[PDB]
């Protein structure tokens with residue numbers, strides 16, 4: 288049985304609690320995050336969703352045209368979707384800094400410095416950064432009194448934000464050789480392993496990759512998928528953005544564009560043969576800046592029901608202009 | 609710094625010019641253009657354009673059929689092409705980095721010299737149309753890679769026991785001697801490929817995030833090899849603002865994006881010769897067209913005045 292080229296079963300899932308969305312390059316990652324968030328929220332009115340970002344550029348705020356911050360806020364126009372933009376690294380520095388100060392005048396796992404081993408042991412910084420994020424969330428849940436059913440992580444445009452899933456095994460290997468700090472490491476290792484318990488369960492968390500139909504994007508996506516596999520995180524979906532089905536479009540005249548399409552077609556076919564088992568969802572190029580709830584929802588719709596270049600053209604051109 | 613390759617195309621000191629760029633960035637076209645440009649401006653000298661890509665990109669580019677044996681490009685007096693497959697034409701390979709590369713390269717250098725000894729005519733300069741994959745020239749590190757190894761053995765072997773050491777019979781010493789001979793071979797080439805006036809690498813890329821990222825990586829790798837990197841050609845630029853405004857908001861949209869990175873490129877690689885090359889919808893194929901296009905590597909293209917020239921190719 289063919290694997291539907293859409294995210295319908297995910298957007299419809301009542302089992303997933305953590306959905307990570309990423310893609311390097313200018314591939315429409317942010318708008319994909321918002322679209323998945325909206326689509327999930329509209330399809331499950333009964334539940335509450337959190338869309339979190341780490342990008343210091345406040346991509347979410349300029350995506351929706353609202354102002355989000357460290358405090359969750361419901362997207363204006365929706366009942367069950369909220370956004371929060373934070374900076375884990377910054378808050379970590381502030382917290383670590385004060386801990387260093389308390390040391391000189393004497394996440395509890397910081398007394399003094401466990402952060403110095405950062406530039407030595409891979410994934411400790413990331414684990415600490417992530418724990419910061421998980422903290423800001425729970426604190427928001429405890430105050431507002433309402434817990435989020437599902438969280439969409441608009442992954443950070445750089446680094447390897449979730450390399451910490453390797454931390455546990457990276458430590459055991461180290462702790463054996465080496466056999467204060469030692470106690471903080473074991474406490475950290477226990478924290479990352481309870482998370483892996485969650486993040487490693489296919490029914491609980493998954494990662495959807497975002498990319499454009501180009502050689503470098505395809506290879507970057509391959510790289511990303513291998514990495515996610517090496518973390519035991521589920522990867523079953525790939526969103527391919529900016530596709531211009533020039534093959535038959537309104538005002539479709541431009542030969543340069545036709546040339547581009549021919550190129551995209553080339554790789555779209557490689558992607559389909561390479562990731563047959565994946566949900567490979569094709570999304571139309573939408574010249575402009577899909578911004579604001581309305582347009583984002585109109586466009587996000589194609590994540591659930593595959594886009595038809597023939598039939599649905601009218602819909603995207605109501606946005607592209 | 610001038611936004612062209614005029615000084616290189618005009619150099620009478622360079623003997624080896626490598627051209628590379630990953631992705632569909634017009635690497636091959638660039639290789640041919642540089643070869644032609646060099647050949648046309650130095651009729652007095654003989655040039656060799658060699659490729660490794662099994663697809664026979666050179667033959668498809670010129671519309672001629674090249675192979676293991678050098679052949680003059682039809683219509684030119686001092687430019688010849690040679691398409692080889694080094695790999696096609698000793699298992700420490702999957703263990704020590706750069707050994708296979710060095711072996712592959714030496715193969716290439718051998719098919720060349722044997723072509724020079726037969727034809728009786730030596731090539732003054734060679735342009736290497738680098739392979740679209742792997743790390744073809746990581747062997748420049750092999751020498752230091754080996755010294756380190758043939759040293760860790762001395763710190764271990766000379767720090768073991770008469771029995772233990774001697775208790776390892778098998779044709780390995782049959783290697784200690786060949787590794788030292790190969791190390792000597794890569795180091796004589798390194799003396800050549802490491803001299804700025806003798807060899808250089810021109811990068812090719814498109815003005816997009818992923819391509820800039822990739823060429824950034826390429827440059828770092830080349831510097832770690834002590835190979836000179838001073839030029840970067842940026843292909844497929846559609847100067848849509850000057851495009852007689854042939855309309856298409858999608859293309860104008862693309863251009864604004866290319867403009868954004870063209871800017872970053874300028875600021876990041878200021879000391880480099882950053883040559884902007886116009887998008888040329890089609891497949892610049894055949895000597896004539898390649899020549900017409902290649903000219904903009906020497907004298908910077910002008911979207912306003914030169915437009916007519918590239919559209920007589922569309």
Ligand SMILES: [Zn+2]
Nearest residue numbers: 541544856859
């Ligand atoms: Zn166009």
